[PDB]
Amino acid sequence: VADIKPRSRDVTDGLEKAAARGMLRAVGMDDEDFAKPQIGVASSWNEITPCNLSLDRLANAVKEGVFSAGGYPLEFGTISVSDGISMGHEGMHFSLVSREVIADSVEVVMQAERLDGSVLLAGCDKSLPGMLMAAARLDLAAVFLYAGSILPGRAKLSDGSERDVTIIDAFEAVGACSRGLMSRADVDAIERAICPGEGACGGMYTANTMASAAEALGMSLPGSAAPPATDRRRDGFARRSGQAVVELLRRGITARDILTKEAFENAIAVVMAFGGSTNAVLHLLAIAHEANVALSLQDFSRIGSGVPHLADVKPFGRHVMSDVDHIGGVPVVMKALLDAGLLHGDCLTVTGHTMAENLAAITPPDPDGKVLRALANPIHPSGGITILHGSLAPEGAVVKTAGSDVFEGTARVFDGERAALDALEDGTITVGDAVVIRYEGPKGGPGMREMLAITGAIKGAGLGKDVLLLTDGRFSGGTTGLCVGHIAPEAVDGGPIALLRNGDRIRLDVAGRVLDVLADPAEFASRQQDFSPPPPRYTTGVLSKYVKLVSSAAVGAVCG
Amino acid sequence: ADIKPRSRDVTDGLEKAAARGMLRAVGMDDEDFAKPQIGVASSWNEITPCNLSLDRLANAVKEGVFSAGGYPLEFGTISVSDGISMGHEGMHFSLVSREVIADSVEVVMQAERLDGSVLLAGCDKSLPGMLMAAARLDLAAVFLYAGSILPGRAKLSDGSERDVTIIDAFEAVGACSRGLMSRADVDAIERAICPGEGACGGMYTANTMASAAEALGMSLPGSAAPPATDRRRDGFARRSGQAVVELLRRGITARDILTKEAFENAIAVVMAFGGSTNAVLHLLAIAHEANVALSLQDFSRIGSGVPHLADVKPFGRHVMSDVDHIGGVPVVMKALLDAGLLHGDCLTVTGHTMAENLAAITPPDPDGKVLRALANPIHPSGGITILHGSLAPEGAVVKTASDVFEGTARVFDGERAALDALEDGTITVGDAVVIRYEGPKGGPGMREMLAITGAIKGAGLGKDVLLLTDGRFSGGLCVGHIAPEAVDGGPIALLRNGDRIRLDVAGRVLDVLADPAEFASRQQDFSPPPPRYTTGVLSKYVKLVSSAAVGAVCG
Amino acid sequence: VADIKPRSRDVTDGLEKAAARGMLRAVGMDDEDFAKPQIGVASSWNEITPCNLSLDRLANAVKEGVFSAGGYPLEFGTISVSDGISMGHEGMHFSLVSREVIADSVEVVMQAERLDGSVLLAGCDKSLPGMLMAAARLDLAAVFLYAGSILPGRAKLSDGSERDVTIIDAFEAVGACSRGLMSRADVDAIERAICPGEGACGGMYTANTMASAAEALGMSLPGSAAPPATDRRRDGFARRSGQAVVELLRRGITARDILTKEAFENAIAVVMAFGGSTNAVLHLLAIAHEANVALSLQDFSRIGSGVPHLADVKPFGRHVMSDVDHIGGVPVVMKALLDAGLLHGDCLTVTGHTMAENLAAITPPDPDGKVLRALANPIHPSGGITILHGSLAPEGAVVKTADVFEGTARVFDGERAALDALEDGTITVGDAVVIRYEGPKGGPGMREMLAITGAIKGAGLGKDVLLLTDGRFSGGTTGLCVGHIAPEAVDGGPIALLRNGDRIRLDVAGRVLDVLADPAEFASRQQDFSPPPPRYTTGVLSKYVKLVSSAAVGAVCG
Ligand code: FES
Ligand code: FES
Ligand code: FES
Ligand SMILES: [Mg+2]
Ligand SMILES: [Mg+2]
Ligand SMILES: [Mg+2]
Ligand SMILES: [Mg+2]
Ligand SMILES: [Mg+2]
Ligand SMILES: [Mg+2]
Ligand SMILES: [Mg+2]
Ligand SMILES: [Mg+2]
Ligand SMILES: [Mg+2]
Ligand code: NA
Known part of the structure; x- marks a missing residue:
């Protein structure tokens, strides 16, 4: 039977741990708490980019869920950068290395404090694979929760026309202006509309692709990726994420029981079906390496040759993550692939149940046909x-x-x-x-x-x-x-x-x-x-x- | 001086429309693009009491930056517990936390093009981690400490009453295993050692490096000593956010302050406080990050001419809250300067020199009990x-x-x-x-x-x-x-x-x-x-x- | 020159104030802060309704504004109820009385603590007039800031149709279900969509009506009502509200300098132009009473006679407050009314400038014609x-x-x-x-x-x-x-x-x-x-x- 405290007996148990218990009392633990599993709640919350703003309230809701399930949560912070604000100057050189600094940050805290499991919260591009890399490396119980997507903005231009805009529309407006085809007033109008408040980029960029890939890897609760950052359904996913990690500890389940070769093949298939960011090739290879799982570029070819491109999503398509949410989120793509024999149903997930058992429980609808094409009418018969x-x-x-x-x-x-x-x-x-x-x-x-x-x-x-x-x-x-x-x-x-x-x-x-x-x-x-x-x-x-x-x-x- | 040495990369010109558009979503408006951007880097967490006060202090730094005409942006980094990490495999991950923290602040500051930082730390290795990032970036930077924990008193079965800490809990464990103390008394010490927020009160790494940060000129004078639970720390926080914006207005950066002479001030003050041997490792690293020549022989030279003055745990009787009561770190700094054992002309984060700061705050002479006068040392040379x-x-x-x-x-x-x-x-x-x-x-x-x-x-x-x-x-x-x-x-x-x-x-x-x-x-x-x-x-x-x-x- | 501490020398200045100073140190004041004006930041933040959720962050941004302008802010909290969650049971008997408890609450704190001025933050229906009543009653410098509106939610029905829905649609869904005209599945679909997250009811109910009325009274910064709760522009309005209250203290301006008869007539005209809630009659009568200004039901008739219904907005019309924000917010209605001679331009506001001066400075566009009608083509010739x-x-x-x-x-x-x-x-x-x-x-x-x-x-x-x-x-x-x-x-x-x-x-x-x-x-x-x-x-x-x-x-x- 699993030890529900696989690490934290080093700081809570026996005569010798008096000083550690004395310090834990000072963060709030009492007599009754020393027998509980300790959950690190790692948040990349910051105000340097809107992508991370929701993570403050979501970490709180994770702690409520950990308490609800009989665990003791301890929150800590790590960095992220803004992949958007860093564009166009020297900061672009510091985007990908932030991934390595986040994975090391989580490893160091988890290893130093002897915590039993984690819930990892990330918003902006490189923080998602950074957290998933730490989870793989540590091989403790781990649940991944996304910040959620920003809402779309709408620009009023000088000619009375209107468009939905995002980051790319701001960069393209600058380019139109430099070629004398757009007024500085209309660039200004686009700037004011592109990012209304909290949430990561709405298009199928690294953040949404990797949030979808985390459901596909079984590292996030099915259905958790798509609800917008501003949507209070994220709070419910947060509390259930804190409950789930404590149940994984009760089961003796760790991240490498979930991150198998088959789970990586499921992530590849889902990313191929969403026409996800090419960045997901780099990140999923790195997460496999950190999980000590054999994965090559050729595994991407082999799985991708058998999986159709279904999602009509920005930046190359029409829709954004809020539209994928509306038609039933990532589980719709996962169920479509499972029914077509293009997903490994038997992969264990953070629910403690298999991908197939999770999809049977929540019964997603069929692809709507516009946001997510029907399997028989794909954007392309093979991978995006x-x-x-x-x-x-x-x-x-x-x-x-x-x-x-x-x-x-x-x-x-x-x-x-x-x-x-x-x-x-x-x-x-x-x-x-x-x-x-x-x-x-x-x-x-x-x-x-x-x-x-x-x-x-x-x-x-x-x-x-x-x-x-x-x-x-x-x-x-x-x-x-x-x-x-x-x-x-x-x-x-x-x-x-x-x-x-x-x-x-x-x-x-x-x-x-x-x-x-x-x-x-x-x-x-x-x-x-x-x-x-x-x-x-x-x-x-x-x-x-x-x-x-x-x-x-x-x-x-x-x-x- | 240009008050936006970096942030013009994200706020200025046609080409910055996308960055401005994202900055609006964290709350910036039209009038804020002309302001310096200050990164407020918090090592707040709940994994150790040492870091708990940093949440409210980060918030007070932001209020300071706003009051001085800047725009603060808060972010987080890690810290570990040097105490909770003791006695298991976690001890292997303590020193490396310093390098991760330094890298994490560098990454955020370089990626987001922020003009300056206020850096907040509590537990042992997070202080030198922040100081190393400040030295490495060479932008305007102010360091602010979480402050010390309050001392706790354990009543023992034999009617005895003692102030106890981590070493007292570890010693109690040893006494109990040798049959010389009851499990009851070990439990009584456990319950008393850490009442709530604040770093270890003895002159361990955290208090040594907080004191050294005043000595480097990288913290406001008087800021180290007030306990974590004392609301004077909030005023030092607001004054730290004000100070970093003034450094930008004067075009001062960290390497303007972290001169060879500032490092020799830090060694002097650490020697006088009976500071942790860890300060040798940390000041060598901070000088390396500042591109300043500093060696072990520099420690021996300064150490030969600087007596141990502070009667402070673990070697002495008192804790940082006692040092606070008698006037804090500036009392040691004025005593050294008066004796010609401190460089007075070193520029600090106040925009003024160590001598000018000490003249402004007029600290009292050593009290004789918690701090000794120079003629009356605990040892005639550095600890x-x-x-x-x-x-x-x-x-x-x-x-x-x-x-x-x-x-x-x-x-x-x-x-x-x-x-x-x-x-x-x-x-x-x-x-x-x-x-x-x-x-x-x-x-x-x-x-x-x-x-x-x-x-x-x-x-x-x-x-x-x-x-x-x-x-x-x-x-x-x-x-x-x-x-x-x-x-x-x-x-x-x-x-x-x-x-x-x-x-x-x-x-x-x-x-x-x-x-x-x-x-x-x-x-x-x-x-x-x-x-x-x-x-x-x-x-x-x-x-x-x-x-x-x-x-x-x-x- | 006006004393920038018209009240707080009672707690900072003189030998007898030693205790009070020692207590203010413990909330963070140092020697330099005793010379600053003290600003009460009163938040009706809570979690009992989505209407109030944004007020925590907005109260924080108010404080940043007060600090930015050389003031010292002190945050405190008051209740609010949910006019939505209270519907259909005994709780309804406790909605209007919350207005009086909120007013008394802010009066008590401001008078006890001898604060110089206030920023008052409210989200749900009765909390906005509670705060405005307190501001009128105290006659100190006061700025009002709204939580902001909720975003519209989209229901997909068994029918395959899609509707934008809110509370009334949930209550009408229930009625249609018990008369066999809607499935339980479709009621549940509506329940799940009506309220996505933070913010007050998006239609022209009491909250949006009184938030618009507050801009028209000159008690809120112009353009501050319309941006959604989730929109970070509200944060900028919060910091500027904190800056504004300090500048009112420098100028010696108090709430009753702003809440004139002419300002209540402005508020009535804007409520009529929006097809606003009839509850606005009750609350503007009460605010005027608290402000010692003569206002009667006859004033609503007189002003209402001459003002057309311009806003095509729920519950009467099709649109919600986020749509009004898109086309330039409440200032579009106020400039339209000013140009037609249906607004008093010389009313002093919380900017320290007149209504006319504010609208000249921010140059709102003309009514778009769909969300806000031009006066030439109103929805109704007179007030709703x-x-x-x-x-x-x-x-x-x-x-x-x-x-x-x-x-x-x-x-x-x-x-x-x-x-x-x-x-x-x-x-x-x-x-x-x-x-x-x-x-x-x-x-x-x-x-x-x-x-x-x-x-x-x-x-x-x-x-x-x-x-x-x-x-x-x-x-x-x-x-x-x-x-x-x-x-x-x-x-x-x-x-x-x-x-x-x-x-x-x-x-x-x-x-x-x-x-x-x-x-x-x-x-x-x-x-x-x-x-x-x-x-x-x-x-x-x-x-x-x-x-x-x-x-x-x-x-x-x-
Ligand atoms: S810039 Fe953060 S997710 Fe796009
Ligand atoms: S354990 Fe953190 S300062 Fe001692
Ligand atoms: S219920 Fe609060 S504004 Fe409608
Ligand atoms: Mg929090
Ligand atoms: Mg990217
Ligand atoms: Mg195992
Ligand atoms: Mg905070
Ligand atoms: Mg140590
Ligand atoms: Mg220089
Ligand atoms: Mg708050
Ligand atoms: Mg009502
Ligand atoms: Mg007057
Ligand atoms: Na080149």
């Missing part, structure tokens, strides 16, 4: 994300799936985004070019920046469907099937992307899953002698440490 | 002694509560083997007890070991044996920080059972008295154990951490 | 509200209008007797149904009855019967529902002398409500009138009944 291999990316790369044709182009090679933006401004990027931005990898950037300026400018210059964008970094906001990221090995590791020179020919076959450089292997291989990595830009502090310890993007840019 | 010599070529640290101490080496790989030996009677009077592989890499995490110090004292061998480690000690002669550590093939790794060790306090020497040639002939036989932690924060820490001799810095 | 007098209501009555009814009286002592007669089939087409002993004293608490209006409406009798009370009515019948009949039955008004068979006439155009029995015989019955004994002989309602005035003067307690 495509994994590539070939001579340019022998350790793999990722691209959002298109309808389209094969692309061949003459390589145009840049060390960093700034160089490519300059070349675009000077007219040296034209139809048929393959634009290659290298030294943007985990080590090269450093931090593997999500670049939005080059995709924005290519679209603005009308070159959206005529140019191929390729990077060892990441892209946001480009044309489906024409922005390739995560090219491994990255330039700093002397991968083929580092050997490229202006004029080399590149071929991308998305349907055939191939990204090749057309140069004679022998001739191409011997330029290897000339490769030299630029010296690290950041020689002190968190980014200097990151560059020393970080792995390839091909295995999730893990540091441990 | 913290720096050693070198053939066993510690890169340095070691000992609290000298000044003769030659010796022993035949009894050598253990980790604390457990030393305790097993004490239990088997194989440790006797005159032994030099060496616990190696407890360094930053070896432990890993350079534990502050309490089990062996407690067990030796409990066995009556306290004054009869020498204690030596490449890790750290709490309670109890106890030599720590021995460098290079065992994992790096330092002399401590070559020691064998029987080697003669000599500690010479006067000469500042810790020697192995082996023939140098015979001793060096042992190097070929050394091989380090493989890392115990192969995943997570401790596998990373072992890969990056420096020698304790330069502060166990990671980057 | 009609004031009546006559032999049945000598001290007046109030009816929501949109023509001449004559009927035989069917008389009930209390709503329950009327509901029983409807189920019995005793209430029929042509009846003038009289529910008496529901006034301030009679009820007690002048309940807003929804059960009889819903049951009559459900029974298809809406257009066929006249509903009359000395209480209040909530919801329409799609017919005529006359409230506030004064004097009330307890005070031996005509309503108490009525008997089964008397005839009654209601002439909306004539502003008349008459009992058509012969004067001489009707008077003859006064000798045998005996009021029932108070049901509540203990506690707050026993004290309320002893002190409350006529609804004709706002049901004030003195």
Whole structure:
């Protein structure tokens, strides 16, 4: 039978623990509490971004649930950054490393205090995988709860027209204004509308994709991802999350009993079915690594080839998470995939029951057909994300799936985004070019920046469907099937992307899953002698440490 | 000066429409884009009493920043309990918390383009973690302490009444296991040691570093001493938010304040307070983060000229609330300055110098009981002694509560083997007890070991044996920080059972008295154990951490 | 120059104030804060209703504003009830009395602590006029800030239809279900959608009406009413409210400098233009009484005559307050009224500037034409509200209008007797149904009855019967529902002398409500009138009944 106190007997039990008991009294524990499991309630609450604002009330509601189930909760805090506020300046270099700092933050507190289990609360992009990575690493009972999505805003423009707007509409408005196609007054109108109050980005970006993936991994209560941050149903999910973690301790269940290979395959299938963020490839690889579970880029290909793209969601589709909530949330996609034999029903979850048993209990409706397509009428018969291999990316790369044709182009090679933006401004990027931005990898950037300026400018210059964008970094906001990221090995590791020179020919076959450089292997291989990595830009502090310890993007840019 | 050295990246120009749009959703309006943005970094949590006051104090810092025309944005970071972590595997995760906290503040401040910070900490390692981030960022930064816990009084079965704390609970446990105290009396002490919010009241790491923060000029003068439960801390909080905005108006940043001279002020004040040996490790690391040259020999030099004045636990009688009653940290600082043992011209977070601050607040002279006048010291020199010599070529640290101490080496790989030996009677009077592989890499995490110090004292061998480690000690002669550590093939790794060790306090020497040639002939036989932690924060820490001799810095 | 501490030198200055200073240190004041004005921040925050949830964060942002302007804020709390959750049970008798308890609560703290000025924060119906009454009564610098409106919720029905719903839709769902016209599943779908999270009722009920009235009185910052509770623009209005109260102290401005006759006329005009709640009549009469300003039911008639219904907003219209916010909020209505000469521009406000000066500074757009109509194309030519007098209501009555009814009286002592007669089939087409002993004293608490209006409406009798009370009515019948009949039955008004068979006439155009029995015989019955004994002989309602005035003067307690 499970010990409901697998760690906290180190601080509560026996003559020798008098000093620890004396300190725990001073945070409120009394005689009756020392026999209870201790639950760490880790919140990335802050006011530096709206994404995290709901986590204060939700952590409180988690503590109420832990108490309701006979546990003792202890709240603590960790950082997040704003993936939105950090865009367009030096802060973009500090987004992905925040993931590592959050996972380490949770590990250190849980290990130091000998807590038995956790509930982990996150809002903004990198804090979700940061928490899930800590949960995997610790292999204690753990429940993940999301902040919830922001509500959509509506801009009134100068011509009397109106549009629903989000972050991307603010960046695009700036671009329209710079090309003389939009007034500064109309950029102002969009700015005032995009973010009304608390909640993470409403589109299918990293936060909503990973909140959906956490339901799919069985690490969040089914139905918990979709209700908006402002919606008090989140409070109920919070109290039930605190109750659930105490029951996992009673069962002797830990995070690695839930994070099995099959649970990761269920996350891949759900992310493929939502046309989730390509960032979910990086994060799910990293979470598998932290859970000591074998997972490769090819597992993404294999599962993704069998799962249709169903969700018509921003940024590439029409709808936002509040619309997915309205038609029944993530359980609708999970039930559709289970009924089609595309989900492992027998995966244990944080309910203490299997994915199939959870879905039987809540009986989601069928896909509505607009927000989530019917399985027989999908956006694409296979996954919303495509994994590539070939001579340019022998350790793999990722691209959002298109309808389209094969692309061949003459390589145009840049060390960093700034160089490519300059070349675009000077007219040296034209139809048929393959634009290659290298030294943007985990080590090269450093931090593997999500670049939005080059995709924005290519679209603005009308070159959206005529140019191929390729990077060892990441892209946001480009044309489906024409922005390739995560090219491994990255330039700093002397991968083929580092050997490229202006004029080399590149071929991308998305349907055939191939990204090749057309140069004679022998001739191409011997330029290897000339490769030299630029010296690290950041020689002190968190980014200097990151560059020393970080792995390839091909295995999730893990540091441990 | 430009009052927005950073935040123009998120508030200014056409291109910042998206960042402005998100900043409106945390409550900023049109008039707030022109204001400096202050990160208010709280290590608040409920896992230890040390951090409980930080929630209301963060709120008061925000009120201060608003009152001075800034815009504060609160965020959280971790802290661990140095007390609750004692006696189990959690002790391996105490020191590394310092590095995670420093990184966490750097990440938020760099990602969000904030102009300055107010940094709030309670428990041992969170104070140096915040100070290291401030030094590393080189923006306007003010540090504010959670404040001390109130002392609790235990009534014992024998009608006795004593003020008790963590060490009193650990000692009670030892007394009870040796049949010299009832379980009833152990329970009475348990119930009294921590009544509620505030850090340890003795001159442990937290109070030492809070005092050192005033001495660095990084905290408002007088701010360290008021207890966590006292509402004067709220006024210091509001004045801390006001102060950071004024630093922006004057274009002052942390490295303007953290000069070599400020570090020598901090060492002076720590020596005078009988401060924790942990302050050696933390000030070396904070200087490294400020790009300021600071070495163990700097500690020895300042320490030679600065007497121990504070009669404070654990060595003395009083706690920080007693220090508060008689005028707090500025009383020690004025006494040192008057004697020419403090640099008066050091710029501080007030925008004025240490001398100008002390002139403004006119602290009283030492009271004679809680703080001694200079002519009347507890010891004529600093409590913290720096050693070198053939066993510690890169340095070691000992609290000298000044003769030659010796022993035949009894050598253990980790604390457990030393305790097993004490239990088997194989440790006797005159032994030099060496616990190696407890360094930053070896432990890993350079534990502050309490089990062996407690067990030796409990066995009556306290004054009869020498204690030596490449890790750290709490309670109890106890030599720590021995460098290079065992994992790096330092002399401590070559020691064998029987080697003669000599500690010479006067000469500042810790020697192995082996023939140098015979001793060096042992190097070929050394091989380090493989890392115990192969995943997570401790596998990373072992890969990056420096020698304790330069502060166990990671980057 | 005005003393910026008109009250707080009683607790900070002089030898005798040593104790008071020592206590203020313990809430955080240091030596420098004793020279600052002290601002009471009064929050009706609670969790008993969603209406109040935003007030915790907004009270915090008020404090930031006070600190930003050199004041020292001290937060304290008062009650509020839920006008929604109180509906349908004995709790309804405790709604209006909460207004008086809230007013007394703020008076007590402000007078005890010698605070210089206040920011008052309210969300649910009765708490807004409670706070405004306290502000008028104290005559210190005061700024009012609303919680903000709830967001609209979307129900998907078994039908496959989708509706935006709120409380009335939940109560009508229940009526439709018990008459076999809606499934239980669809009632549950509506229940789940009506209230997503924090905020007050989104329609033009008492809260939104009084929040709009507060902007029109000059007691709230212009544009502050309309932004939803969940919208962080409310935080900016909170910080500016804290800044505003300190600047009122610097200028020596107090609440009665702002609450002039002209400002109440502004409030009446804005309430009429919004098709606002008839409860606004009761509360604006009470606020004017507390402010020592002459205001009568006749003023509502005079101003109401000249102001058209502009806002196409629930419950009458289609839209909710978030829609009004989208098109530029209450300032759009106030500028429209100012330009048409239907607003007094020279009224001093909590900005320290005039109503005209404020609207010039923020330049609201013109009415959009859908949510807010231009005056050229109003919904109704005159105000939604009609004031009546006559032999049945000598001290007046109030009816929501949109023509001449004559009927035989069917008389009930209390709503329950009327509901029983409807189920019995005793209430029929042509009846003038009289529910008496529901006034301030009679009820007690002048309940807003929804059960009889819903049951009559459900029974298809809406257009066929006249509903009359000395209480209040909530919801329409799609017919005529006359409230506030004064004097009330307890005070031996005509309503108490009525008997089964008397005839009654209601002439909306004539502003008349008459009992058509012969004067001489009707008077003859006064000798045998005996009021029932108070049901509540203990506690707050026993004290309320002893002190409350006529609804004709706002049901004030003195
Ligand atoms: S920026 Fe935080 S979730 Fe998008
Ligand atoms: S345990 Fe936290 S300061 Fe002592
Ligand atoms: S019930 Fe509170 S505003 Fe309607
Ligand atoms: Mg909280
Ligand atoms: Mg992102
Ligand atoms: Mg197991
Ligand atoms: Mg707080
Ligand atoms: Mg310590
Ligand atoms: Mg400088
Ligand atoms: Mg509050
Ligand atoms: Mg009401
Ligand atoms: Mg006056
Ligand atoms: Na570049």
